[PDB]
Design an enzyme around this catalytic site. Sequence first.
Site, PDB file in Angstrom:
ATOM      1  N   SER D 140     -13.079  -5.285  25.986  1.00  0.00           N
ATOM      2  CA  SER D 140     -13.596  -6.531  26.534  1.00  0.00           C
ATOM      3  C   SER D 140     -12.815  -6.934  27.780  1.00  0.00           C
ATOM      4  O   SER D 140     -11.658  -6.548  27.966  1.00  0.00           O
ATOM      5  CB  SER D 140     -13.526  -7.659  25.503  1.00  0.00           C
ATOM      6  OG  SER D 140     -12.183  -7.959  25.160  1.00  0.00           O
ATOM      7  N   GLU D 183     -10.883 -16.528  29.648  1.00  0.00           N
ATOM      8  CA  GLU D 183     -11.478 -15.212  29.852  1.00  0.00           C
ATOM      9  C   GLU D 183     -11.803 -14.892  31.312  1.00  0.00           C
ATOM     10  O   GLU D 183     -11.694 -13.710  31.680  1.00  0.00           O
ATOM     11  CB  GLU D 183     -12.721 -15.074  28.960  1.00  0.00           C
ATOM     12  CG  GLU D 183     -12.370 -15.085  27.476  1.00  0.00           C
ATOM     13  CD  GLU D 183     -13.479 -14.563  26.588  1.00  0.00           C
ATOM     14  OE1 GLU D 183     -13.595 -15.046  25.441  1.00  0.00           O
ATOM     15  OE2 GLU D 183     -14.231 -13.670  27.029  1.00  0.00           O
ATOM     16  N   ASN D 228     -23.658  -5.456  18.786  1.00  0.00           N
ATOM     17  CA  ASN D 228     -23.020  -4.147  18.882  1.00  0.00           C
ATOM     18  C   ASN D 228     -23.994  -3.015  18.579  1.00  0.00           C
ATOM     19  O   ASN D 228     -23.938  -1.958  19.219  1.00  0.00           O
ATOM     20  CB  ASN D 228     -21.813  -4.084  17.948  1.00  0.00           C
ATOM     21  CG  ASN D 228     -20.658  -4.922  18.446  1.00  0.00           C
ATOM     22  OD1 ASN D 228     -20.662  -5.387  19.586  1.00  0.00           O
ATOM     23  ND2 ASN D 228     -19.661  -5.124  17.593  1.00  0.00           N
ATOM     24  N   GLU D 254     -20.023  14.281  36.942  1.00  0.00           N
ATOM     25  CA  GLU D 254     -21.401  14.102  37.389  1.00  0.00           C
ATOM     26  C   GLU D 254     -21.807  12.632  37.414  1.00  0.00           C
ATOM     27  O   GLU D 254     -22.647  12.241  38.234  1.00  0.00           O
ATOM     28  CB  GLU D 254     -22.371  14.903  36.514  1.00  0.00           C
ATOM     29  CG  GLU D 254     -23.515  15.519  37.321  1.00  0.00           C
ATOM     30  CD  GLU D 254     -24.493  16.320  36.478  1.00  0.00           C
ATOM     31  OE1 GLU D 254     -24.075  17.336  35.887  1.00  0.00           O
ATOM     32  OE2 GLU D 254     -25.685  15.946  36.423  1.00  0.00           O
TER      33      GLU D 254
HETATM   34  N1  LIG Z   1     -20.359  -7.523  22.467  1.00  0.00           N
HETATM   35  C1  LIG Z   1     -19.258  -7.799  21.772  1.00  0.00           C
HETATM   36  N2  LIG Z   1     -18.307  -8.648  22.301  1.00  0.00           N
HETATM   37  C2  LIG Z   1     -17.185  -8.932  21.600  1.00  0.00           C
HETATM   38  C3  LIG Z   1     -16.977  -8.377  20.345  1.00  0.00           C
HETATM   39  N3  LIG Z   1     -15.790  -8.832  19.883  1.00  0.00           N
HETATM   40  C4  LIG Z   1     -15.247  -9.655  20.812  1.00  0.00           C
HETATM   41  N4  LIG Z   1     -16.105  -9.728  21.880  1.00  0.00           N
HETATM   42  C5  LIG Z   1     -15.910 -10.496  23.122  1.00  0.00           C
HETATM   43  O1  LIG Z   1     -14.615 -10.222  23.626  1.00  0.00           O
HETATM   44  C6  LIG Z   1     -14.023 -11.397  24.145  1.00  0.00           C
HETATM   45  C7  LIG Z   1     -12.702 -11.643  23.432  1.00  0.00           C
HETATM   46  O2  LIG Z   1     -11.958 -10.450  23.449  1.00  0.00           O
HETATM   47  P1  LIG Z   1     -11.511  -9.674  22.110  1.00  0.00           P
HETATM   48  O3  LIG Z   1     -11.867  -8.204  22.214  1.00  0.00           O
HETATM   49  O4  LIG Z   1     -12.139 -10.298  20.884  1.00  0.00           O
HETATM   50  O5  LIG Z   1      -9.911  -9.896  22.099  1.00  0.00           O
HETATM   51  P2  LIG Z   1      -8.853  -8.684  21.987  1.00  0.00           P
HETATM   52  O6  LIG Z   1      -9.258  -7.554  22.900  1.00  0.00           O
HETATM   53  O7  LIG Z   1      -8.700  -8.206  20.561  1.00  0.00           O
HETATM   54  O8  LIG Z   1      -7.483  -9.304  22.561  1.00  0.00           O
HETATM   55  P3  LIG Z   1      -6.631 -10.408  21.757  1.00  0.00           P
HETATM   56  O9  LIG Z   1      -6.593 -11.653  22.610  1.00  0.00           O
HETATM   57  O10 LIG Z   1      -5.232  -9.885  21.541  1.00  0.00           O
HETATM   58  O11 LIG Z   1      -7.270 -10.709  20.422  1.00  0.00           O
HETATM   59  C8  LIG Z   1     -15.008 -12.528  23.920  1.00  0.00           C
HETATM   60  O12 LIG Z   1     -15.715 -12.710  25.121  1.00  0.00           O
HETATM   61  C9  LIG Z   1     -15.941 -11.988  22.862  1.00  0.00           C
HETATM   62  O13 LIG Z   1     -17.246 -12.488  23.042  1.00  0.00           O
HETATM   63  C10 LIG Z   1     -17.931  -7.521  19.805  1.00  0.00           C
HETATM   64  O14 LIG Z   1     -17.763  -7.019  18.693  1.00  0.00           O
HETATM   65  N5  LIG Z   1     -19.071  -7.235  20.526  1.00  0.00           N
END
Ligand SMILES: Nc1nc2c(ncn2[C@@H]2O[C@H](COP(=O)(O)OP(=O)(O)OP(=O)(O)O)[C@@H](O)[C@H]2O)c(=O)[nH]1
EC number: 3.6.5.-
Lengths: 332, 427, 54, 437
Positions: D140, D183, D228, D254
């Site tokens: 993310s 974010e 997902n 590619e």
């Molecule tokens: N599409 C999708 N987005 C996700 C998912 N889980 C978290 N997000 C998005 O990721 C963002 C938050 O990042 P996370 O991946 O949850 O946090 P992290 O990478 O574990 O980092 P930490 O702050 O240490 O918890 C938010 O915008 C969420 O909407 C997921 O399973 N699918």
Amino acid sequence: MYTFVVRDENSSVYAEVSRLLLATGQWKRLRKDNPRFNLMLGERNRLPFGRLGHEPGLVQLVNYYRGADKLCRKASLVKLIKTSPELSESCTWFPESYVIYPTREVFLAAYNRRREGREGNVWIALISSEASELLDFIDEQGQVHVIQKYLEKPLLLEPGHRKFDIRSWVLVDHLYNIYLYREGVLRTSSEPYNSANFQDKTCHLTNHCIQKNYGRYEEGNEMFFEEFNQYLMDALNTTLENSILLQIKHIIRSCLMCIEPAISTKHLHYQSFQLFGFDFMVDEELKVWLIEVNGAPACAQKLYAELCQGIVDVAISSVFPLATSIFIKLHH
Amino acid sequence: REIVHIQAGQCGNQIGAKFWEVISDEHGIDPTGSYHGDSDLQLERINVYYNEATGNKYVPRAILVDLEPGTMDSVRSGPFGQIFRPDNFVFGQSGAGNNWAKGHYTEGAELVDSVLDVVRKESESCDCLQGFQLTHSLGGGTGSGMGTLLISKIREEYPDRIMNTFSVMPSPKVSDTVVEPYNATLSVHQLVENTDETYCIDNEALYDICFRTLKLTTPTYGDLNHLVSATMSGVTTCLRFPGQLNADLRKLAVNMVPFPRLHFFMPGFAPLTSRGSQQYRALTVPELTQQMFDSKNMMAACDPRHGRYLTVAAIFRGRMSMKEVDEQMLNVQNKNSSYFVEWIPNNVKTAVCDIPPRGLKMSATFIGNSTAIQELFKRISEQFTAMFRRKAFLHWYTGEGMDEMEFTEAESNMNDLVSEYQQYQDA
Amino acid sequence: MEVIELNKCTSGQSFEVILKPPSDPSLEEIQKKLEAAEERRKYQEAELLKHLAE
Amino acid sequence: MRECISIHVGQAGVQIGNACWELYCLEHGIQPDGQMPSDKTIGGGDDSFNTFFSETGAGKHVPRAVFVDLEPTVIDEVRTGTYRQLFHPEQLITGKEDAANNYARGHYTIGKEIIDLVLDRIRKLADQCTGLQGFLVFHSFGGGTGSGFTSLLMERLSVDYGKKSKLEFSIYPAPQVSTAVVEPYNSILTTHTTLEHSDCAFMVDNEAIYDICRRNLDIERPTYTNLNRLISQIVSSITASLRFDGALNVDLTEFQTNLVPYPRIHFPLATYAPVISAEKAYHEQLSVAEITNACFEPANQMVKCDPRHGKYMACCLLYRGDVVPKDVNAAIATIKTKRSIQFVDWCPTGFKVGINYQPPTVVPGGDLAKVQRAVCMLSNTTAIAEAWARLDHKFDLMYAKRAFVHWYVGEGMEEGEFSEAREDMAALEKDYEEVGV
Ligand SMILES: Nc1nc2c(ncn2[C@@H]2O[C@H](COP(=O)(O)OP(=O)(O)OP(=O)(O)O)[C@@H](O)[C@H]2O)c(=O)[nH]1
Ligand SMILES: Nc1nc2c(ncn2[C@@H]2O[C@H](COP(=O)(O)OP(=O)(O)O)[C@@H](O)[C@H]2O)c(=O)[nH]1
Ligand SMILES: COc1cc(C(=O)c2c[nH]c(-c3ccc(C)cc3)n2)cc(OC)c1OC
Ligand SMILES: [Ca+2]
Ligand SMILES: [Mg+2]
Ligand SMILES: [Mg+2]
């Protein structure tokens, strides 16, 4: 309570739309940079279209069509008319034009048969009759404007052999309905027209402000539709609808249906409407020609009230409803 | 991610005991520490506040601190009194006399090391201790003076852990002594420096809610503590039950606190309920949202329309439409956008938990970081200055070794905090 | 409309169709970035411990 | 055959990795215990699916994957979930306390203590490869781990594997499902540090996936599981050429060659059709023309933007199911006359087409319906820069008041990195504008 923001304070039209919206008791104005708006009366240049339609819980609408500038810049309008297969062959309503740069060979090809045809041959940018008298005029300006055949034989009003252009206001809503305001305006020349020399300029092009003799025949060089129709009936035994208005509706319909695939917001995350100002001029054969398209037009003083209420009725309340028509719908 | 709980003084131990009663009921723990509940979600995150003991008993990771034994003997004799570990009762005998200086510098200095020993022993049992939470009042002596001394020393030994407090603000409407503005002002100076999150629980607000809304003509401390326990249960819902966020103290601090000193939150609760009386009509999600943002549901006596929201966190409890919650939450922001700072985009966060609290089919807890909290500190500052200008009642403090300079400095830091909150109200 | 480079197999096929022709930091630099940030953290930590000592 | 290693970082990267690898198994006929009956070369091979799966002597096909999170809860569900036997325990790396939505905490504070462990576990997979291509990195933008640790990991992979291609699958932040107010900060910080270390990055705006789930799946309030499983379908169509026989996009290089002529402009827009609800009682199956036409509707894009107001630098069409080239060229001809498809003057106006005959596979009991044919369009259009403009604006609103900056400075970062990262994004916006008009 619907919400809206105002980002072009120089807008005569949408300053009046704001007060009309506020006087409903159901529209609250926010600060320019507040993103939580339903409606955006946006700026003229660099409107942030990419920021619209990403606010959850808000239906967002804008008073501009992204991409409509291709119709509203003289250079792109010329390019759009020559290149679009929807226009080029049967474009009897646009004057022969060519895009010139101050840093052409096609432009001289027509003026060299005009040189060996012995017909009228004056063109326009700010006018001259010799080719290179404007070519020097172009290279010193530093920007870009189009060269354009001037209409030597225009329709002249009587009394006073006066020149005029017609301004039509057109509203295109979020469904791409094309609404032509039933009230146009003739912007007259309060000076008799002169074909002898083009050095005397302030009689040829009828700008509402470049008339800085004046108001002789009607107020502010503005002749509205009822009298011009009455004049056409008395002088020429015809009506404004038959002699001119059919072609104006055809041209507006043609130009807007051409760019429809490029600017439509039908399945878009935000929606668009826009008020346009089409400028026409009529020759002495009662033939209508398109001059320019203004994407941010100002209304005539007598019609600010009626038109701006119609903008609210047709383009705003249709999307955001609250708790006989003045427009002519151009079908497609 | 374990939390170590500390309650100090009369008020801190009384609201602290009520907190452990309420969450113990939510997690299905009985006064003996045995789990006789029905849902596995009641134990998935019981690690946060309870240690597991032999015989599968759950013991609160709680430390009970006071400079006199009266309230702590009342806790042991109370309903859930035997649930606490007896070694975690750390008390003196001389009392504090509602004197911040006695708690911070003299009487509390005798006892503070014995408390820190129990904190250390509870911390060593922790898989990954995330931080501490303190319950106390700011108007007295022990919870005010010794509570802030504990916070300073805990930060010295655990500098990278989160310090969270539930701080009860004094009010002349519910007043034990006249020196309460002195104790609160000296305490706020400590809280601004040494905590990451402080829930400002105003006894003025608790009185008005009991008087005007709950229709109680002469409310007790027990009626005030009913509001505190229901609020404390809501703000800890995300810590004690699983959710989509995997919530902890540090993420809350990161997202709620744009500037380190402005970490004093306005709590709120809906629906507002009295003791014994039972709600019969469950609230609509629109009603939950309207009431939770109502000034009359705020636990700090401040007008939210007199300031702006830097950040907001909202926690809904019960079986409800998450679509309806999303539209109602978006509805408040879109209809009142002027009251949320435009320079922090999307500054409202919403969590939903399926299990409601005892007695309610659905509830909503509000946590706001609003610049209107400056009204609370300005109120304390006014009552402080009306006495300090005449140096009134100061001998109680100079007798314990304090100088007038420390009062002047504490007054200036709180006046600075007021103007700092005002800085961002106009932006 | 020109169809080019058609390749076929059991699983499917692929091709290009043309409508119109054309008109790093090193390891040590990273280690000295993560360590500069650690010293900054340790300076802030020492400043707090000096403040708490006062 | 040339192997590819997938790296899943943070919660978003891990949970999307679960979705993709569950889908890969169903597509390749790989069983939850790792067995694959259709594989007759027991104990090894150089087949196309071996790009993503290595083999044991006992016939187990194990993903060439590593999962890393600074916190155990999400990877713990993989350790105990339906595919627990698929993964070797050393491929699943967890810390104990996460980055708390802080880019600097994931990149500097916590990342420095775990980066060496991760690279060694990544080295253990690379040593099993006879000819490694590179990495596919899932993360993310908004998380502290997904942003902070990924950037550090991408920096190191350029050092230890400077020869290898690196592709990103990046989840762009959306307020409807986001978890942190900072974010936009994390997105800008991680895009700046990672920009030169990524060869091609597919951005997925959670807002686009959210609305597609609402509109086309009749899901009132989509969950991560809803998002997902849809995302996994799009990732699958993009990686299908690496796992199946074919002539188009057979190798990671590619992807850059076909989609990225300018190194910094390496964010292709993905568009997918059709998305059809499983609960739909009567569905008229959509033709090649209808699904190819749907590739030019912004409602089907992974990022909401208007390609009509930009210029294309490349365009790939990836079909799965009952599709033959005749129908494709016929559909392209009709679309070309009715839509605004402007290429830059220095690139040919043309589509690169790949067709796999196996129709898309769907998770049983999922939300997506089985369709007779589907397509994923990969187009490098300047219009995607709208997402950067949106992100940079929210960044500028917060950073003007220096809101939350103290959380980053307190982890060892310097305030100047904010403006350095923002400067790079300003340069990035200019690059799209020069190419776009
Ligand atoms: N599409 C999708 N987005 C996700 C998912 N889980 C978290 N997000 C998005 O990721 C963002 C938050 O990042 P996370 O991946 O949850 O946090 P992290 O990478 O574990 O980092 P930490 O702050 O240490 O918890 C938010 O915008 C969420 O909407 C997921 O399973 N699918
Ligand atoms: N809400 C609430 N406030 C209390 C309670 N007990 C005392 N207070 C308030 O706390 C202040 C007195 O502090 P107290 O805790 O009794 O002194 P301490 O024992 O030295 O910490 C006054 O402002 C009281 O109004 C209580 O049970 N509930
Ligand atoms: C410790 O207890 C909690 C922790 C968390 C939390 O970990 C978290 C993640 N993100 C955010 C957040 C907060 C505000 C804004 C504007 C944006 C994001 N908080 C959230 C809670 O309830 C909302 C909670 O209960 C009070
Ligand atoms: Ca094999
Ligand atoms: Mg007392
Ligand atoms: Mg995480």
